[PDB]
């Protein structure tokens, strides 16, 4: 894998090694709020993170992942558009070089400063690697970030980033409560899509919350001090690690709310 977010290896190049990049259910997409249909059959989301066990934070050269113990049903997503039980494996963000870009999904073409992805896999497939081979394998909960007031529950993440500056660095990251990253409302849009990074597998039920969270300028500035490069390599700031909106094709975006 040599894909990334540069001019020479960014999203417009990915199709050469991952031809599904041009597929029928790629993510992210623009959410056209007036075209999304309210679906009264959609259930409230059930986010059950009370027993979540965070373990570690990793700079993987594209973003940082906060990893969870997914060896039991400890932190699960169910309800909403989903059938069955999806276990939280990791969360990460996508963000920009400036506050006017960074999100992957857009809302009426609006780009947010960043987007949080809480990644869950369907327990009926047993392991994450098996789940990504299935059309209903993953559920990703997407949350927009705007710049304003600080998000108190984000600060523990911000403060460990200095210890994982470069690709391949990890740090212990226990006892982090991801409930501190949610907005007040669980109103959402949903559609069938894909992973937004290679291998771009078409295995995701996307659940994108309408209500953004607010983070401070200082918090997002610390995201932008991370590096895509490994230790001792030429410094490349980890910024603009987002894929732009892809064609909606033969898909419907449904709203949980009127
Ligand atoms: N684990 C596995 O057996 C293989 C090989 O390592 N991995 C994958 O086939 C997919 N890995 O997918 C990560 C991933 C990528 C993108 C997202 S996003 N940005 O759509 O939430 C969320 C997870
Ligand atoms: C040099 C190079 C550029 C881009 C890729 S890709 N198709 O994985 O994005 C691989 C190698
Ligand atoms: Zn993501």
Q: Contacts from 132-136 at CB under 8 Å and sequence distance 24+?
A: 132/195, 132/199, 132/201, 132/203, 133/201, 133/203, 134/203, 135/192, 135/202, 135/203, 136/83, 136/203, 136/205
Look at ligand 1, atom 16, and give the residue with the nearest C-alpha: 195
3 assigned to some structural domain: no
6 assigned to some structural domain: no
129 assigned to some structural domain: yes
36 assigned to some structural domain: yes
Q: Are 177 and 155 in contact (CB under 8 A)?
A: no
Instruction: Compute the distance from residue 229 Cα to the ligand 2 centre, in Å.
Output: 16
Q: Which residues line ligand 2 (CB under 6 A)?
A: 2-3, 8-9, 13-14, 16-17
- Ligand 1 within 6 A of CB of 243: no
In 3-state terms, the chain is what percent helix, strand and coil (to 5)? 15, 30, 55
79 assigned to some structural domain: yes
Q: Which of 23, 128, 244 to mutate to test the pocket of ligand 1 (most atoms within 8 A of CB)?
A: 128
Instruction: Give 220's contacts (C-beta < 8 A, 6+ positions apart).
Output: 95, 99, 102, 113, 114, 145, 147
Degrees to nearest 5, angle at CA 5 with 69 and 241: 50
Look at ligand 2, atom 4, and give the residue with the nearest C-alpha: 9
Question: What 3-state DSSP class applies to 156?
Answer: helix
* Beta bridge partners of residue 86, listed in sequence order: 77, 122
Q: Are strands 76-79 and 45-48 parallel, antiparallel or unpaired?
A: antiparallel
DSSP-derived secondary structure letter, 145: E
Distance CA 94, CA 238 (A): 10
Rg (CA), the chain: 17
1 assigned to some structural domain: no
Q: Are 204 and 139 in contact (CB under 8 A)?
A: yes
Residue 180: CB atoms within 10 A of its CB come to 15
Distance CA 42, CA 126 (A): 26
Provide the CATH number for the domain around residue 233: 3.10.200.10
**Total number of domains in the chain:** 1
Look at ligand 1, atom 20, and give the residue with the nearest C-alpha: 195
Q: Are 92 and 104 in contact (CB under 8 A)?
A: no
- By residue range, what is the domain housing residue 88? 11-255
Active site residue 62: yes
Instruction: Give 126's contacts (C-beta < 8 A, 6+ positions apart).
Output: none
Show the beta-strand stretches assigned E in 83-230.
Answer: 86-95, 106-107, 114-122, 138-147, 170-172, 188-193, 204-209, 213-215
């Amino acid at each position: 894998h040599h894909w990334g977010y540069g001019k020479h290896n960014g999203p417009e190049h990915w199709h050469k090694d991952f031809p599904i990049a041009k597929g029928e259910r790629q993510s992210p997409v623009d959410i056209d709020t007036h075209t999304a249909k309210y679906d009264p059959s959609l259930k409230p989301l059930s986010v059950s993170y009370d027993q979540a066990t965070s373990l570690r934070i990793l700079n993987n050269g594209h973003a940082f992942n906060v990893e969870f113990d997914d060896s039991q049903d400890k932190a699960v997503l169910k309800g909403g558009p989903l059938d069955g039980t999806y276990r939280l494996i990791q969360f990460h963000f996508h963000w920009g070089s400036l506050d006017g870009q960074g999100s992957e999904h857009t809302v009426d073409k609006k780009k947010y400063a960043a987007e949080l992805h809480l990644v869950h896999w369907n327990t009926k497939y047993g392991d994450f690697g098996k789940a990504v081979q299935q059309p209903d394998g993953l559920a990703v909960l997407g949350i927009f970030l705007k710049v304003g007031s600080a998000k108190p529950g984000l600060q523990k993440v911000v403060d460990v980033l200095d210890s994982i500056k470069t690709k391949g660095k990890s740090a212990d990251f226990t006892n982090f409560d991801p409930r501190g990253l949610l907005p007040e409302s669980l109103d959402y849009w949903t559609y069938p899509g894909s992973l937004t990074t290679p291998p771009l597998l078409e295995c995701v039920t996307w659940i994108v919350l309408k209500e953004p969270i607010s983070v401070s300028s200082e918090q997002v500035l610390k995201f932008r001090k991370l590096n895509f490069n490994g230790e001792g390599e030429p410094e490349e700031l980890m910024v603009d690690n987002w894929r732009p909106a892809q064609p909606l094709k033969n898909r419907q975006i449904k709203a949980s709310f009127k």
